[PDB]
């Protein structure tokens, strides 16, 4: 469960992202595609080349869902209940690869908000991304 300071940290951190959430979502995907090619096989009908507009578009969707999840940390299993059926039941995504995207998002955030990415915020963001992951798997 997320503590009050966890929710506070997650919301604070996401506010410091400013207007770059879509941009950061796309970079996390691109990072995941370079460091972990196995994730590319989930996207058969995507152009995954560097600078791709499909990657750019999908990053905005991921960032949007994350923004949505931040808005409803209190009842997350419900806010993502829709996404949970798509990833788990339909796309059939390895519960293990959620960790790869989570790592890549944290790396992106670290690289862009060094001052904001304190240990406490890093722990809160990691628990947040893990809870999101478990929701999309369980």
């Amino acid at each position: 469960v997320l503590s009050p300071a966890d929710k506070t940290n997650v919301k604070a951190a996401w506010g410091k992202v400013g207007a770059h959430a879509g941009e950061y979502g796309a970079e996390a995907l691109e990072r995941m595609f370079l460091s972990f090619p196995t994730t590319k096989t989930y996207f058969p009908h995507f152009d995954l080349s560097h600078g791709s507009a499909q990657v750019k578009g999908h990053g905005k969707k991921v960032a949007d869902a994350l923004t949505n999840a931040v808005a409803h940390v209190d009842d997350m299993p419900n806010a993502l209940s829709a996404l949970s059926d798509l990833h788990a039941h339909k796309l059939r995504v390895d519960p293990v690869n959620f960790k790869l995207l989570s790592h890549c998002l944290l790396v992106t955030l670290a690289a862009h908000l060094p001052a904001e990415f304190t240990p406490a915020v890093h722990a809160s963001l990691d628990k947040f991304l893990a809870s999101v992951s478990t929701v999309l798997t369980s």
Binding site: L34, S35, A111, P119, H122, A123
Partner: protein, 145 residues
């Protein structure tokens, strides 16, 4: 399979790294983010929160020790297995650290490099360092097999 660019990227960034600061930061963040890892560090004193862990002198010292032995490997990237052969026996036989934890610590290190280098830490530069992390975790698991 360290490519020519991998080696070049890893050597360059490691030169710019302040080992004491990255090391303490790295070990500290491992302990805060992945609380079970605190089981191996009971004697370091108060590890109850981000504030206690990050200001703990024993955590600082020890992470610096972790990170320097990693710096040894970067001089000899082709034989990671050799370099880490004795640390493997240590972490496996004596400490009984599960190998998955090696990948966790390497990923925390990658995030600490990202903090230090900012926009220099591109997706390509990160891919090289993920290789290093995977290689190191592999070399440390070697006496598990």
């Amino acid at each position: 399979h360290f490519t020519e660019e991998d080696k070049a990227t890893i050597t360059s960034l490691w030169g710019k790294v302040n080992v004491e600061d990255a090391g303490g930061e790295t070990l500290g963040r491992l302990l805060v983010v992945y609380p079970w890892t605190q089981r191996f560090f009971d004697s370091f004193g108060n590890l109850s929160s981000a504030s206690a862990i990050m200001g703990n002198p024993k955590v600082k010292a020890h992470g610096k020790k972790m990170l320097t032995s990693l710096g040894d490997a970067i001089k000899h990237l082709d034989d990671l297995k050799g370099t880490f052969a004795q640390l493997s026996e240590l972490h496996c036989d004596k400490l009984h650290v599960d190998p998955e934890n090696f990948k966790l610590l390497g990923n925390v290190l990658v995030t600490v490099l990202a903090i230090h280098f900012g926009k220099e830490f591109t997706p390509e530069v990160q891919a090289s360092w993920q290789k290093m992390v995977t290689g190191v975790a592999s070399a440390l698991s070697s006496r598990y097999h």
